[PDB]
Design a protein around this ligand. Structure first.
Ligand SMILES: [Mg+2]
Ligand SMILES: [Mg+2]
Ligand SMILES: [Mn+2]
Ligand SMILES: [Mn+2]
Ligand SMILES: [Mn+2]
Ligand SMILES: [Mn+2]
Lengths: 184, 184
């Protein structure tokens, strides 16, 4: 035995920032991951990468995205990034291999289908690294809004639209529902 | 006032069967929808359509899919179908617009990201008709397996791989978790 954090029971949390909502025509501009155990304890935070994209593309973003990504400082980190999809993927992969094996953990986060659709198109290896299933906190959010609005309203999230920050919020949100929405 | 079931609080449940897992390469061969209220009471079941596809496509399915879709009788229903994506979408659309307005309800069901990706590519209008978000029972399934295995194991689901029967399972599974996993 040893005290290393590896285990196939471990959960992988991942968030992305994109130039838009269309996985076929938009790109990934940021990636972050966090590994927790099944009890939601953070074991290690993964690398956070601004992913370089050609400026001609970044200037074809709508107002909402140019506003948010400039504001958060992400657009600047992107212009000065020497990391493309493959390198981010590889490094992320090397990190995740330490805590859990391939296809073991579901994709964990908030509204992660969109992420799954970008991963599938731009990061096939990392995408395949996840189990087919998803652990989406947003589902708990919906149920809290419909069935226990006072519970949902007690955990207001203010997203900074930065991957590492958002992943941290996703975990905290799940921890919250476990205590206040779940029968355990 | 009136006793018609329409409401923007109503939920739309939808299941699909495909020829495979690749949305850019595979096709929808079945669709079904069910509308419930927020309390999960079933208001009305929607049209269940076997969707016609050419034999050259169906015969290119792997063993697993040819086995399941033949056995479930879906394959014969597909060959004999006079309905394509557009007609199924239109009729489904005409049905849904009587219980909820556009973009109000999340996509509801089990592991619906796969469905969202086929809907997006093959049924643009119906896809736009849902709210961006998802209500996935699979998420509850995961948490129960990790945090309360005895609860998860008390509702074993045997899927027939027929859209309408799967939708009815997804609802009853949510009803099951609401009672035995939720703090209500
Ligand atoms: Mg975000
Ligand atoms: Mg199925
Ligand atoms: Mn996100
Ligand atoms: Mn984010
Ligand atoms: Mn299904
Ligand atoms: Mn199904």
């Amino acid at each position: 035995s040893n005290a290393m954090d590896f285990s196939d029971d471990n959960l992988i949390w991942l968030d992305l920032e994109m130039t838009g909502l269309d996985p076929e025509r938009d790109r990934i501009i940021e990636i972050a991951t966090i590994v927790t155990n099944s009890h939601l304890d953070i074991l290690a935070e993964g690398p956070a990468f601004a992913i370089h994209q050609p400026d001609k593309l970044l200037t074809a973003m709508d107002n909402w995205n140019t506003s948010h990504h400039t504001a958060s400082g992400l657009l600047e980190r992107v212009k000065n990034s020497s990391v493309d999809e493959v390198e981010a993927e590889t490094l992320t992969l090397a990190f995740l291999e330490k805590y859990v094996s391939a296809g073991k953990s579901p994709l964990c986060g908030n509204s992660v289908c969109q992420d799954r659709r970008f991963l599938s198109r731009y990061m096939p290896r990392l995408n395949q690294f996840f189990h087919y299933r998803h652990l989406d906190v947003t589902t708990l959010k919906i149920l809290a809004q419909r069935w226990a609005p006072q519970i949902a309203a007690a955990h207001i999230k203010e997203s900074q639209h930065l991957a590492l920050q958002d992943i941290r919020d996703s975990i905290e949100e799940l921890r919250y529902y476990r205590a206040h929405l779940l029968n355990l």
